[PDB]
């Protein structure tokens, strides 16, 4: 076996398991899901003795997994290498937990002002906290100044990037926070109007938006004198955002 050497022996047979997903979503202003999918991978930090035989199972709540691209050791069952390695990549598109709901509200004031209001609605267990929340609201190219106040977090107008950045430390599920802006516009040519860019989001949530959960991870070493009841197994679900936009 060319991915694992013989004779490995650890004292504390531990097992770290990270489930890493990236939720992608495009949503109309009215809340209709235009396109959405999750891209995920499962990495395993293995510290087991000898040449163990491992069986990884899950709910395949339920979830269907569209694509699969496995490591070279599998057949699920596998002899895992020593250390950190990627066990599998996957992608689902059905029954995806959308962790946040961006609700834009833009109101023209003649041809000079732009009163804008954006509401975030967290949509998960209130016992869990989302972290590293960023909401990017793009401003028109003909902006002289913006005026924003917000309840939770802090907001700044990065005029160079031509957008408003709103950052929130944490936010529990089943909650809502809002931000309100006044945008002063220079006069310009009404001709082109402007291509309304979407409102982007970035967050971290301690669960798999695909609903995936680890049913079992069995370890089997027949030669050595340890069984699966002796393995200190851990699992860590982390979901990041990728392309998370709402048409405004």
């Amino acid at each position: 076996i060319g991915w694992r050497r013989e004779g490995i022996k650890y004292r504390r047979n531990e097992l770290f398991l990270d489930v890493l997903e990236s939720v992608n979503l495009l949503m109309s202003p009215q809340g209709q899901v235009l396109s959405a999918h999750v891209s995920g991978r499962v990495v395993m930090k293995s510290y087991l003795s000898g040449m163990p035989e491992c069986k990884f199972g899950m709910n395949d709540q339920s979830i269907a997994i569209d694509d699969c691209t496995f490591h070279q050791c599998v057949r699920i069952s596998f002899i895992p290498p020593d250390g950190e390695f990627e066990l599998m990549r996957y992608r689902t598109t059905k029954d995806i937990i959308l962790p946040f709901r961006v609700i834009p509200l833009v109101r023209e004031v003649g041809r000079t002002k732009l009163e804008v209001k954006v509401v975030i609605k967290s949509n998960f267990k209130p016992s869990l906290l989302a972290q590293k929340i960023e909401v990017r609201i793009p401003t028109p190219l003909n902006t002289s100044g913006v005026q924003v106040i917000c309840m939770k977090g802090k907001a700044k107008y990065k005029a160079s990037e031509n957008a408003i950045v709103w950052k929130i430390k944490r936010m529990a599920g089943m909650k809502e926070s809002q931000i309100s802006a006044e945008i002063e516009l220079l006069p310009t040519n009404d001709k082109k109007k402007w291509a309304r860019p979407p409102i982007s989001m970035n967050f971290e949530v301690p669960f798999a938006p695909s609903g995936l959960k680890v049913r079992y991870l069995k370890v089997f070493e027949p030669k050595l004198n340890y069984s699966d009841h002796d393995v200190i197994k851990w699992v860590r679900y982390i979901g990041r955002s990728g392309i998370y936009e709402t048409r405004c």
């Binding site: 097992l15 770290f16 398991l17 680890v214 991870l217 197994k233 851990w234 699992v235 860590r236």
Partner: peptide, 6 residues
């Protein structure tokens, strides 16, 4: 950080 597998 991590949680134990039940």
């Amino acid at each position: 950080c991590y949680e134990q597998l039940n």
